[PDB]
Amino acid sequence: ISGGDAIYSSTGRCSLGFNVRSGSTYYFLTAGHCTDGATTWWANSARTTVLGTTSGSSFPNNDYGIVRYTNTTIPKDGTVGGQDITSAANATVGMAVTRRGSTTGTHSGSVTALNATVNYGGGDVVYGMIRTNVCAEPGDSGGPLYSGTRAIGLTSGGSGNCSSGGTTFFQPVTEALSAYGVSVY
């Protein structure tokens, strides 16, 4: 299972952002809105293949969560789809980026702004977000935003759609890596 693949919780479906690790312990990052109130994660809709359990969740304010892998045999690729990821980097205005998610697959665009505030309602406000002209649709939450072999962000939310074009906001991945003491591989 790699970046961009579907993940299921008891409530719905999200996308795996990046596989990360710390020492010998493997986890994956996804969106905090997806980890909030989820405990166990599975790799299929039938919930027959277990992935792991939520170890941390930060949403609103930020929008990242991490899950610790309990499944010992599933392959944990350090890629996004077939794309290798070797480091994390900070977004910059004009940067060419690509998103991959479980509903729409792979789409590309660029960063149009940094440190944006997105207000999802009822007090769910997120700060510090990367804005882009990449589309995204329901199911795509928590998938990766990358550039080449560099990990950049995690899908949080947005407007519009892939048919007509849209705007998507991503949580900087660096902040999550640092929060949990984990790293990409």
Partner 1 sequence: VDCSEYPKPACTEEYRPLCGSDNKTYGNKCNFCNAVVESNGTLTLSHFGKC
* Binding residues vs partner 1 (CB under 8 A): 11-14, 31, 33-34, 101-103, 118-122, 124, 136-141, 155-159, 167, 169
CB-based contacts of 5, cutoff 8 Å, min separation 6: 15, 16, 43, 102
* Residue whose CB is less far from partner 1, 15 or 83: 15
* Active-site pick, 15, 33, 102, 140: 33
- How many Cβ atoms sit within 10 Å of the Cβ of residue 105? 13
Asked if 74 and 1 count as a contact pair (C-beta separation under 8 A), the reply is yes
* Residue whose CB is less far from partner 1, 26 or 118: 118
The count of residues in the chain is 185
Q: Minimum distance between the CB of residue 55 and partner 1, rounded to whole angstroms?
A: 19
Q: Is 107 a catalytic residue?
A: no
* Residue whose CB is less far from partner 1, 26 or 154: 154
**DSSP sequence for 92-138:** -TT-EEEEEETTTEEEEEEEEEEEEEEE-STT-EEEEEEEES----T
Q: Minimum distance between the CB of residue 165 and partner 1, rounded to whole angstroms?
A: 15
Q: Minimum distance between the CB of residue 156 and partner 1, rounded to whole angstroms?
A: 7
Distance CA 68, CA 28 (A): 7
Q: Is 63 a catalytic residue?
A: yes
Distance CA 89, CA 172 (A): 9
Q: Is 141 a catalytic residue?
A: yes
* Active-site pick, 58, 63, 107, 156: 63
* Residue whose CB is less far from partner 1, 24 or 163: 163
Q: Minimum distance between the CB of residue 183 and partner 1, rounded to whole angstroms?
A: 25
Annotated catalytic residues are 33, 63, 141
